[PDB]
């Protein structure tokens, strides 16, 4: 997915969402945020979507 | 080596001429060992996604 070769659709009914505000003048790659989010998913529950 | 084997055969052998009796006794012990009541326990549900 990180490479431009795959697109994934995750079917969620409803979920808690959180969001971060960045500066448009600062280039960045947002992969670490998702990886952190993935790092805390388990069959018991999930953290809020960033 | 339940019977007919105490002081007649070696520790590393088995009597081939008394096989039926020994097998029968072994099964009898197998049977007697399982005479129990399958008691119930605490059933519960799982909140896990599985």
């Amino acid at each position: 997915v990180k490479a431009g070769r795959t697109r994934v659709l995750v079917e969620l009914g409803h979920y808690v969402y959180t969001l971060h505000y960045y500066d448009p003048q600062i280039s960045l790659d947002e992969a670490p945020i998702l990886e952190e989010w993935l790092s805390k998913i388990n069959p018991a529950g999930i953290p809020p979507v960033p | 080596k339940t019977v007919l084997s105490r002081g007649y055969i070696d520790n590393a052998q088995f009597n081939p001429l008394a096989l039926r009796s020994n097998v029968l006794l072994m099964l009898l012990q197998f049977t007697l060992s399982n005479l129990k009541i399958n008691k119930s326990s605490t059933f519960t549900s799982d909140v896990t996604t599985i």
């Binding site: 805390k40 388990n42 069959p43 018991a44 | 909140v47 896990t48």
Partner: peptide, 30 residues
């Protein structure tokens, strides 16, 4: 403060049983 109560012990036990590791060391990512 908020109202919250511990879940029944039986449920917690079974739930904690099935918790695979989220991140694992795999020598392959190709």
């Amino acid at each position: 403060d908020i109202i919250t109560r511990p879940t029944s012990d039986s449920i917690a036990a079974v739930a904690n049983a099935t918790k695979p590791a989220a991140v694992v060391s795999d020598p392959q990512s190709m």
